[PDB]
Design a protein around this ligand. Structure first.
Ligand SMILES: Nc1ncnc2c1ncn2[C@@H]1O[C@H](COP(=O)(O)OP(=O)(O)O)[C@@H](O)[C@H]1O
Lengths: 190, 190, 191
């Protein structure tokens, strides 16, 4: 059960949930496998915060183990589109798609805790059926792999060759090593 | 003139008495005003002046004697209040039509609503108009009058109180200052 | 869980859920598999917004992976019947039914994000029964495909023959390809 927290206002006291109260402070949480419904909820929070203050930077925590790639793009595109700079704070496990959101964070505001784990890997999917159909799906996943790899090199700054090599197989990267790879700016001081 | 001027302004008394009182007063005034051997005939100007004091009018509204004040009313206000000149032209035009006899017969001079951002000089132009025209400024904070019980104070007094000389706070305030600006703040909250 | 949000009104503060708050701004959300229940909620939102301002345009975000075709017609017919133009924005991906609703928006108000995907394929269905019954159902699904290809051609502007060839098998259209194909006017980057 999510707890409720009273808020102090001059007119009168109000009651809000812990997650909703944090939203007033421009704090958006992310957790669990990425899903279409979960992504639209985060997107809704981003749009609402933008209208309230398009200048104040947003904070987005990430503790997801990865999920569908398509829904994750909806969050990425929105973050780039919205004027506020999202401050991605990796608080836990960050899979291929989870790590992608960290790189999408505005440069200079990306953060990762010292004991956080960030693993990257190529998109995983499959199809079964006629050979003609498999060809379409096979080509599509390869094209998607290029797009994610290309956008990974944009934020990280590493060459496509380097991104291809690390992402070809499952890779696990610690918090200090992430700074070297350019995935995150620097760890939180305090 | 006296009979018509008294019917429109002096509504507390009845028609025969009010007309006779301004006629008797006008004659007596004409006796004290001159030192010796002055004009015998009583001009309407004198009639207008006596009815004004009875109604508590400042003697300027009766006839457009101070046309110079209206000529520079907009310019005087425009210099004191920098910006929103479009607002000032509308208030001045309303004052001119009424003083020229083209105003509403049974309605206030001008009913106006200022819809603007908080902090802009909405009240400022109102205060400068009162000071410039030489008329009392009645400021009412509608935020106070947000409950049903508070509304009764405007028209009436608390139950069990005679309130013969105090009555309402809005109703009686205009009696003391018939020619005065009435300003209501945060009317939406009302 | 749905986070609540607070809005400022003259009389007092107003608390609304995040989804309902966006409804006030004419922003509808089409997420998940299409269904008769979720579709009923979408049309309900459309009719409500029309009365508020039948001139202001509606915005329908599309992040659905496809669903039943029957429910889509309720949304498609509702979109065309109402005077307000519906703006379709493809978020993440748009399947055959989602793409159909996507292209169904008013000309000039169809958009796709640069990283969104668009898949289109002939309707999928199956009927197990006697030969006589299968005959009726086979004709109906084929008739349904005819009605979708004709309507897709109208909105997209491509010939019926081109849509039939492209829709015979599954095909994935990236965001820029959608503009060339005619599914959307342009990418949503500036406004
Ligand atoms: N256009 C203006 N010119 C000069 N002073 C102004 C102007 N607008 C606002 N001010 C000043 O701002 C303060 C608040 O003005 P006021 O009319 O009481 O605001 P509001 O209409 O929001 O209640 C005062 O000091 C007033 O003199």
């Amino acid at each position: 059960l999510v707890p409720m927290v009273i808020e102090q206002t001059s007119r009168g006291e109000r009651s809000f949930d812990i997650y909703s109260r944090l939203l007033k402070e421009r704090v958006i949480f992310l957790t669990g496998q990425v899903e279409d419904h979960m992504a639209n909820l985060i997107v809704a929070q981003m749009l609402f915060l933008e209208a309230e203050n398009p200048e104040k930077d947003i904070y987005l925590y990430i503790n997801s183990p990865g999920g569908v790639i398509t829904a994750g793009m909806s969050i990425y595109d929105t973050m780039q589109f919205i004027k506020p700079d999202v401050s991605t704070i990796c608080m836990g496990q960050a899979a291929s798609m989870g790590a992608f959101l960290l790189t999408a964070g505005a440069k200079g505001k990306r953060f990762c805790l010292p004991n956080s784990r960030v693993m990257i890997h190529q998109p995983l999917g499959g199809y079964q059926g006629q050979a003609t159909d498999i060809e379409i799906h096979a080509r599509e996943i390869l094209k998607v792999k290029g797009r994610m790899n290309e956008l990974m090199a944009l934020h990280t700054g590493q060459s496509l060759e380097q991104i291809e090599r690390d992402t070809e197989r499952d890779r696990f990267l610690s918090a200090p090593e992430a700074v070297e790879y350019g995935l995150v700016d620097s760890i939180l001081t305090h | 003139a006296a009979v018509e001027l008294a019917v429109k302004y002096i509504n507390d008394r009845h028609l025969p008495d009010k007309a006779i009182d301004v006629i008797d007063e006008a004659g007596a005034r004409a006796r004290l005003m001159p030192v010796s051997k002055r004009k015998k005939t009583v001009n309407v100007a004198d009639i207008e002046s006596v009815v004004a004091r009875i109604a508590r009018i400042p003697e300027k509204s009766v006839s457009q004697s101070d046309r110079d004040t209206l000529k520079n009313l907009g310019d005087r206000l425009k210099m004191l209040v920098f910006g929103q000149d479009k607002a000032i032209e509308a208030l001045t035009e309303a004052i001119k039509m009424a003083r020229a006899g083209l105003g509403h017969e049974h309605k206030p001079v001008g009913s106006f609503l200022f819809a603007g951002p908080t902090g802009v000089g909405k009240t400022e132009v109102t205060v400068q108009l009162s000071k410039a025209l030489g008329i009392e400024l009645l400021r009412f904070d509608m935020s106070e009058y947000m409950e049903r019980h508070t509304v009764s104070r405007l028209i009436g007094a608390p139950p069990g109180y005679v309130g013969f000389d105090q009555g309402g706070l809005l109703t009686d305030a205009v009696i003391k200052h018939p020619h005065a600006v009435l300003l209501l703040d945060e009317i939406e909250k009302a």
